[PDB]
Ligand binder design. Structure first.
Ligand SMILES: C[C@@H](c1c[nH]c2ccccc12)[C@H](N)C(=O)O
Ligand code: NA
Ligand code: NA
Lengths: 386, 383
């Protein structure tokens, strides 16, 4: 439940029974033979795992420093690492005898991944999405509708991701006998931060076997962008006990930390309690969630998962920021140099990796988690770049 | 060079030297260890091969006949099977000392694949595209530019694929000493139909091993959509000598064969010379306009090896309309959580019809040539 002092189940009594039922169900099925056979089967045949580990030779030789490897989660079905968590939880839901999935979404990518997994498993899917986000993400909403899901606009509060989460939680109180609430990052009340991290750990376990194969040793640095923190946890977690391996999470620096338009919860936020968890959040002086910004829509959650707050506190991982402008340059650079169009979220990790590689030697090794592909972002980049 | 009465090498004398060079270099490198090391390395770590073979359990149970499997080329880097060929030829070009790739594109899909491979290998990429197609494919034009390629709008004539093909050919005549002409389908003068087919054959070799693993048997039918024919040949070719395996190519029926607005060169076209090859082309003997909702099926001809397989009755060729493809696009999305390319949706649609009339112990493999992300604008408008 806790990662040091972070985490918890900060919820109404009305949620304690669904959550206890979830943890009981998860404890049973996490190591169940049939559950893991079925999970691996869908990950392999439907999602396309394992994803490759790619040596960005041209990018590496251009910068002239450490070897830059990319964990290619951009090749997973759907175009983002989120699918690993969507399948895991949707199948867990099915094993629990649930016939409906609900989920929050802001950028729309979790909604699409949930919709995909619900379609795969023949479940009804209802997606809660703040009206501001429904407006900004027409194409992802359309994907969700194509995949058979209902998108429910959320008109309360700030009409955004934080409000979608709260409305989903209210649905779940009424409907948990037949509904599973599929949370999209390593956030929320226990047992979600653990479950989502466990379902994403496949990334780091594959990456570990692949770097040992390609290079004969562990990497010096693993770099991943941090929205809520699931892609980063997925790749960090199997290396947590490898003391040589440096872990770096990259948050959205937006227009710059001094501008106030960013979403760097760990670098600039403070401890708080929202959405059932004690963690770091960006808050106004009255202790309410403040507006956030990033060019990458998957990085604009005002909080971060408790397990990252923990890793930062104990100094196991370093957390840094990259600006909109730096992300955007790395988006173009990776496209031109390696023929891979990254997600704007992932481009943050690429931008930082490029800076870090320059100060390191040519025998040292960086793995960047390329969390997604950039097709979803082409409308944004066309407007802001040209 | 010849596939029965189809194929050949109908080019001006100036192009005979570069094509003989291409043939000799191909013969040299196709079985060369270093070439195959790099190729397999790029296919594995950059493109993500092997792609999986997926049992569409819900679609299979719902229709209630044959087992439907999908070869998931929608998961290759770029979202289309075209990447397999773009890497293969771009690597061939690099091994031949070429520094520049040119290509033709109508939908933008081959242009993007070529741009991707050229970026990977550090080669200049110029893509010829008819001005009308430029306007119709804004986002693919943007991808190509993001990847470092130049998109040359062709303003002559109708400003569409045929005008872009004529311009690329003129360019290749001038620049072949440092430029490789990267043809996007099993079409063109020898040796392109053989080369592209060999670079797509990996699809079929994987599929064969995967279905043997999954089911202990070969499929009863293999279904693939057919524009120029490369994804279909890629998946067909390793099964050509397995007599049991039926091979079904699906062409664009468009608004209906009767309507005159389709791209069904094998079913309704006539034999003749276009793009350096002798094959079926849609003609009046000038090139007639073509239509499909799936922009990748807009090519006015078809590869000579398909004309041959049709002639000897080794493969059957059918058509699916815009309407049937669109329904299968929605059906797959809803039923399996896979948004297919509109091109691949033609094969899905036909396989669904066919599965209904087959036994439940029988197996259909559909080549899911691509993903539908590129088609969401088109589908938003039409649906
Ligand atoms: C990043 C991701 C997301 C989905 N759910 C989240 C919860 C907390 C933090 C982030 C998320 C995004 N907003 C999406 O909906 O795709
Ligand atoms: Na955050
Ligand atoms: Na045709």
């Amino acid at each position: 439940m806790w990662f040091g002092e972070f985490g918890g189940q900060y919820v109404p009594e009305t949620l304690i029974e669904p959550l206890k039922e979830l943890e009981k169900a998860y404890k049973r099925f996490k190591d169940d033979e049939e559950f893991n056979r079925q999970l691996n089967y869908y990950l392999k045949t439907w999602a396309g795992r394992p994803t490759p580990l790619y040596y960005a030779k041209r990018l590496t030789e251009k910068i002239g420093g450490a070897k830059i490897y990319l964990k290619r989660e951009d090749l997973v079905h759907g175009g983002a690492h989120k699918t690993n968590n969507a399948i895991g939880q949707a199948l867990l839901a099915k094993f629990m005898g649930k016939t409906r999935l609900i989920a929050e979404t802001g950028a729309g990518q979790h909604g699409v991944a949930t919709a995909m997994a619900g379609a795969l498993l023949g479940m009804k899917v209802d997606i809660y999405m703040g009206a501001e986000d429904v407006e900004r993400q027409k194409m992802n909403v359309f994907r969700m509708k194509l995949l058979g899901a209902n998108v429910i606009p959320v008109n309360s509060g700030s009409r955004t991701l934080k409000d979608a989460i709260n409305e989903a939680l209210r649905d779940w109180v009424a409907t948990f006998e037949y509904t599973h609430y599929l949370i999209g990052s390593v956030v929320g009340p226990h047992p979600y931060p653990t479950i989502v991290r466990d379902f994403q750990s496949v990334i780091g376990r594959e990456a570990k076997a692949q770097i040992l194969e390609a290079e004969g040793q562990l990497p010096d640095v693993i770099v991943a962008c941090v929205g809520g923190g699931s892609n980063a946890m997925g790749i960090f977690y199997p290396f947590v006990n490898d003391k040589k391996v440096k872990l770096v999470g990259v948050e959205a620096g937006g227009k710059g930390l001094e501008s106030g338009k960013h979403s760097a919860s760990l670098n600039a936020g403070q401890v708080g309690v929202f959405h059932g968890m004690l963690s770091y959040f960006l808050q106004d002086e009255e202790g309410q969630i403040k507006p956030t910004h990033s060019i990458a829509p998957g990085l604009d959650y005002p909080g971060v998962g408790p397990e990252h707050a923990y890793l930062k506190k104990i100094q196991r991982a370093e957390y840094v920021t990259v600006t909109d402008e730096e992300a955007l340059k790395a988006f173009h650079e990776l496209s031109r140099t390696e023929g891979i169009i990254p997600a704007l979220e992932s481009a943050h990790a690429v931008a930082y990796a490029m800076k870090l590689a320059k100060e390191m030697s040519r025998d040292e090794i960086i793995i960047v988690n390329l969390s997604g592909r950039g097709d979803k972002d082409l409308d944004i980049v066309l407007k802001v770049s040209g």
